Amino acid sequence: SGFRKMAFPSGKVEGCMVQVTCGTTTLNGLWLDDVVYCPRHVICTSEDMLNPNYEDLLIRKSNHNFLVQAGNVQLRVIGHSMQNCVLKLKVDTANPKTPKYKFVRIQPGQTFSVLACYNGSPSGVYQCAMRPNFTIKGSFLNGSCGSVGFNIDYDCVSFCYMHHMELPTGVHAGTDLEGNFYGPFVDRQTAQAAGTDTTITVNVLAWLYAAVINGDRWFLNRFTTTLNDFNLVAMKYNYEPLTQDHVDILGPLSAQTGIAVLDMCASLKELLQNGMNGRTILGSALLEDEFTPFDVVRQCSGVTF
Amino acid sequence: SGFRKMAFPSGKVEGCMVQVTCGTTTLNGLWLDDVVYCPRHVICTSEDMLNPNYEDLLIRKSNHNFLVQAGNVQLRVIGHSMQNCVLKLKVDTANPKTPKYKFVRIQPGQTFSVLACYNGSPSGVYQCAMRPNFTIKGSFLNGSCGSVGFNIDYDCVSFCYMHHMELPTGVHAGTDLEGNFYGPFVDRQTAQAAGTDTTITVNVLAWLYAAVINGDRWFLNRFTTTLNDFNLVAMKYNYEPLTQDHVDILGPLSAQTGIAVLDMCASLKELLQNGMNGRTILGSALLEDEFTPFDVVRQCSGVTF
Ligand SMILES: *C[C@@H](C)C(=O)c1ccc(C)cc1
Numbered sequence A, B: 001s002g003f004r005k006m007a008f009p010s011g012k013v014e015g016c017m018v019q020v021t022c023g024t025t026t027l028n029g030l031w032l033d034d035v036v037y038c039p040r041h042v043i044c045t046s047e048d049m050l051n052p053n054y055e056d057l058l059i060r061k062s063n064h065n066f067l068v069q070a071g072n073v074q075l076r077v078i079g080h081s082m083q084n085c086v087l088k089l090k091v092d093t094a095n096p097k098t099p100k101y102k103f104v105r106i107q108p109g110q111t112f113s114v115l116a117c118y119n120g121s122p123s124g125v126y127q128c129a130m131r132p133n134f135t136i137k138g139s140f141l142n143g144s145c146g147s148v149g150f151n152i153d154y155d156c157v158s159f160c161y162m163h164h165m166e167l168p169t170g171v172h173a174g175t176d177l178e179g180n181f182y183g184p185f186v187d188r189q190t191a192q193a194a195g196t197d198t199t200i201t202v203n204v205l206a207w208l209y210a211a212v213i214n215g216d217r218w219f220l221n222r223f224t225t226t227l228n229d230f231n232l233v234a235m236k237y238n239y240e241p242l243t244q245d246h247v248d249i250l251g252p253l254s255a256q257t258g259i260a261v262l263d264m265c266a267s268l269k270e271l272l273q274n275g276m277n278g279r280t281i282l283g284s285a286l287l288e289d290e291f292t293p294f295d296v297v298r299q300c301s302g303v304t305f
């Protein structure tokens, strides 16, 4: 028992982190096979970040300008190219620690672990979610760019995020590993503001199921509701609309607990309308929404890698 | 910016996790050099857990009864012994992935990362704290015993916890790596209840400093207090007494923010007396107490390993 914000074991990714230096800028890169991926703004000066023409800036760079260091050993760069907002540095040595992996573009509401790194060295690991406004609420400082987010499937690391930018509001924006930003954000220091940070309803419900499994049940009530009635309430509180697809996804948690999905919606409805009244659920005083249904099943079962 | 419950990178520990099978029981072991550490209750049957005489139960076991598997390869056990509540299995091969390490017995209020494992395979990583009642609030299921807690110091893994027991209240108890339980708990299925779960005041204050650093400042007030006045309030709310040693430890965070320690105590005092009024601090609606002062400095600076 017990339920914790849990990240994936980070060892497989630790073995892929390298340092990339272009001029005086030092970011992180991801070394898979004989390619190193990093944010293209490694080539920019702090001044350039206001309106960079990356294509023009790249013309002044050659293979030998990209210094790539795996631990204490330098890697030899034998080619480079730009794909969207990432750079692909071809090196002459395959990473011997490359795990089985894939690149995945995740959907808002999906969760992933982030390995925060600086100068190519891991600093810590935490769990995040792609927010409905396509930001993530991370923990990133100068030089953290190029740190990646990922999920693990027994033996396969699915990379879904690479970190690029911090918005003036302190939230974070980045790309998939093909270099395409999540949401409308760009690798420019400009006026880009995040949209509404709506709450991920299906994740809240999964977490309420997690609570029931782990002993917390004071919020269960004698009521039920319908998808349309609930969604009327979800809208007033800036919650994602709940769909039949979401209901279907919660099926297994409903079976394991014997609480119908729509009964749990009625519990969530009452919590939204009346608050927590100073109580807590799984050690939180708010409704947590960065656990997916699959996360809850995984932690409450013990899936390994 | 941003502040997250952050665990240490787990790769160094992942390389030490093995499976230990005695009879039909399968737990986790920690493989360092040519020794494997695991909970002594690996030798117990479920029936035995009520009143086991481990010394007598061990007499029936020989080296070949302890099956140790690192991944898919079996390790040869050439000796075994009991030290307090752990078993030390001497194997004929040093772990090639052994990191620089130490065994440390931590104090209540200190934090550590836990690598949750099952059948010797890592499942996830999360951050914990030794509670003042010497429990930890973890996430553990059947077979998780032998999972360990640790801190990392650039290159040195300090092991501080090995998991043994879940109490009927759903909290967790375990030992240091010399096999000595934290608190009064025993590896017996019996009536052992946890004491008061008091709040770790110095950690709450560190986290409030973390909030100020990262933009959250609505709770700052125009007041101050004294150690004796504050501690009068800490007692009514089941908070640890704050000492001058705690004040000294918060010195660096006070300098970085320009907020005197006792001024921050007055802010915490008002939050205890009046609550949050429906607001949040660093995304929480309660006062978080599993970040140490050193944790806050580390995350807000970017220390690596
Ligand atoms: C732009 C970089 C990857 C990043 O996320 C950052 C840079 C500088 C500070 C102070 C914070 C975050």
Ligand SMILES: *C[C@@H](C)C(=O)c1ccc(C)cc1
Residues within 6 Å of the ligand: A001, B140, B141, B142, B143, B144, B145, B146, B163, B164, B165, B166
């Ligand atoms: C005793 C073992 C290590 C443990 O922590 C546990 C065992 C069984 C369940 C259901 C939960 C936790």
Ligand SMILES: [Cl-]
Residues within 6 Å of the ligand: A283, A284, A285, A286, B283, B284, B285, B286
């Ligand atoms: Cl909370």
